[PDB]
Every structure is written in C-alpha cells, then in structure tokens.
C-alpha cells in the first residue's frame, strides 16, 4: 500500500485548501517544497487551523522537526503519530481520510 500522505510538489495554497476540509485533528500531508527545492514540508490541520512545518536536515543527513532526528521521512512521520509536531499544541499526526 503506497503511503496516503505523500503529495509530491503541490503548492502550499493547495495543501491548505485540501486540509481545511478534513474533519479530524492531525490530518496531514508531506509535500516537496516549491519555495525551497530539495526540501520537504509538513502541513497539518489542528482545530480549524492549518499549519506548516519545514522538514529540517542536519550535518549528518538526518530529518527532524525540532530535536529528535530520523533517517527517513517515513520514520519521522510514524514517530509523530504519538509525539506532538508542535511545542505549544498537542498535535498528533493522523492520516487523511480519502
């Protein structure tokens, strides 16, 4: 089963439009950034808001959002299904329903 969260190169605006229509908190998607080629972005719905996070990379080639580092996007995503992607809000990743 291919992952339901990879949307490729979709505009930031299209991600917001799609996510605002989701009904559950945590609905998310990973997209290839248009403003920063080579980078990935994570867009998530929480409440009635849609937020964007940049997938950061370190000198060792690892992916991360804040502190915990991962070897792949897949691992970063799965970890955040039970660990908040936000420091001020409790936002756990949940697959888009479609």
């Amino acid at each position: 089963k291919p992952h339901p969260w990879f949307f490729g190169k979709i505009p930031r605006a299209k991600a917001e439009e799609m996510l605002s229509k989701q009904r559950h908190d945590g609905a998310f998607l990973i997209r290839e950034s248009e403003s920063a080629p080579g980078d990935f972005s994570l867009s998530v719905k929480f409440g009635n808001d849609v937020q964007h996070f940049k997938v950061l990379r370190d000198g060792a080639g690892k992916y991360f959002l804040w502190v915990v580092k991962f070897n792949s996007l897949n691992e970063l995503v799965d970890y955040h299904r039970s660990t908040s992607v936000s420091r001020n809000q409790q936002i756990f990743l949940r697959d888009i329903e479609q």
């Binding site: 930031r12 403003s35 972005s41 937020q51 964007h52 996070f53 940049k54 950061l56 959002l65 936000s86």
Partner: peptide, 9 residues
C-alpha cells in the same frame, strides 16, 4: 517569504 511553525525569522 513563507513561514513555518518550526522556523524562526
């Protein structure tokens, strides 16, 4: 430019 919750300007 675009803002991200985990990136400080």
């Amino acid at each position: 430019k675009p803002f991200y919750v985990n990136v400080e300007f």
